[PDB]
Amino acid sequence: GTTGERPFSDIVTSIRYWVIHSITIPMLFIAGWLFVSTGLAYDAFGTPRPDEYFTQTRQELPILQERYDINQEIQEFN
Amino acid sequence: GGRDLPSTGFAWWSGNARLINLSGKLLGAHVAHAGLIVFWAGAMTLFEVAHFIPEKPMYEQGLILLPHIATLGWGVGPAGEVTDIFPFFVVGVLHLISSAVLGLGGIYHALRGPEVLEEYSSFFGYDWKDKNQMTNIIGYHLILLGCGALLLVFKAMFFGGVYDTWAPGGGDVRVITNPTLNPAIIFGYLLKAPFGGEGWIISVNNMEDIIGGHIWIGLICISGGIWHILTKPFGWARRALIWSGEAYLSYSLGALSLMGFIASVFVWFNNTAYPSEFYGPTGMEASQSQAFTFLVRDQRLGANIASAQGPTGLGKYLMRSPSGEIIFGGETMRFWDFRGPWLEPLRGPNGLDLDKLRNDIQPWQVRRAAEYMTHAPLGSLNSVGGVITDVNSFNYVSPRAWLATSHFVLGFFFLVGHLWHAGRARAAAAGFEKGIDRETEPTLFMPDLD
């Protein structure tokens, strides 16, 4: 009835699994936390911070209109 | 008692069915649960007191328990203004402490007390099939229900009064002195149609009728309690009903479903037992308030509000009901049965009176109409007030909306529970709740249909 792997209930009730995952799951959690809280996610994905939806020279939506040269368009949009 | 499937035949997800024939543990379940109800009453009241801003209207503040206490006449004055915060706190504390007592008693009977009460006492021990004992328990509990209704009567007549929104001089806590004992009025409320303009018992519009109904209910429940202590079920009742614990449960489920629907409609339509000073305006109230607000505003600008036709040809502000009554125009024509203490002074025998609309409108009626039209029971699930196309700046859903939605849903699911337990009670008493017996399958002996 079992494909051959260790059953999940035997794994998550073992001391070794919790010794390892008591560090690995909080480290992944705080790594995602530091991805957001250091502001790195904003520069990585190009998502505006709450103060860069509009600039001093642009009060309108920065809707892309060029077919190809979108790097220059977004830089201009700032 | 069995606490597993091999010894009961009931799984964990149906565990409380393991108690059907264990009367002591059943009593402890029932009493711990009552603990829970009184616990929510007390703790929710203390929460509502802690979050209450008393100079702000209760209905702005997400309160459904303090309006109930305020309608009884505690902690409020004229126009439902909060005199003292202490009666609400007292009601909360007493429920919370008592709930501790009820919880300790349920745990006892549930975990330590005798699992069956029949070998211990004949008065408390019951068999579900013992029709005399079942009606005895009905009878004790009916005398107590009648005593509760008479306690409401005593609060209204002898211990400070109830809030009357219809009181002259403005709505106030007043002592009821001449309750309607006339059985023609009291039971003609039961005979009235459940439709527009009639409203069955939802249309009770005065505190004298309410308090007189509770004198009669108290009398009826006390008399029915003695009846059922002293008597046994008759032959037609014995041959008509299923006599089992699940059957009696399902009868109570159908009863609870009916009262849940009645409560949702009551709080949605009735402004007497649910005064608009505490619960906010009804939907009909708010629509009539908007029509009145713009009647007053355009009359101040010099519009002839009676001779003004709208775009359709009907009167823009005033028009005729289907029976001819002079009513407000636009879509609120639907709500021309609405009655409220701010509006009834402008009504004549034929409906809305032109003379009173011209030279009898007071500033407080304008203020109340503006407040009620802007506190209409329209709101989003995340409590954004007004119409759903509005933007996020008004944190409001009416207590009438919350109470009505809750009790409608509760009432529906308790009808579902009635069908489930009635059907199962019938199948279990008839012996095929566990499935069709293969040897004596009834269809295999029936003739073919065609």
């Binding site: - | 929510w40 703790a43 929710m44 203390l46 007191v49 802690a50 915060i85």
Partner: protein, 37 residues
């Protein structure tokens, strides 16, 4: 607001009403402690 001499326990009151919900959770925990038999 609460009466003033009770105002030190305003946070506890703020978590009081959801205790019945935990009761519905608690039975499942107890069934988990016995193996859902």
């Amino acid at each position: 607001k609460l009466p003033e001499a009770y105002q030190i326990f305003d946070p506890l009151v703020d978590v009081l009403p959801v205790i019945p919900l935990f009761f519905l959770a608690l039975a499942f925990v107890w069934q988990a402690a016995v193996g859902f038999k």
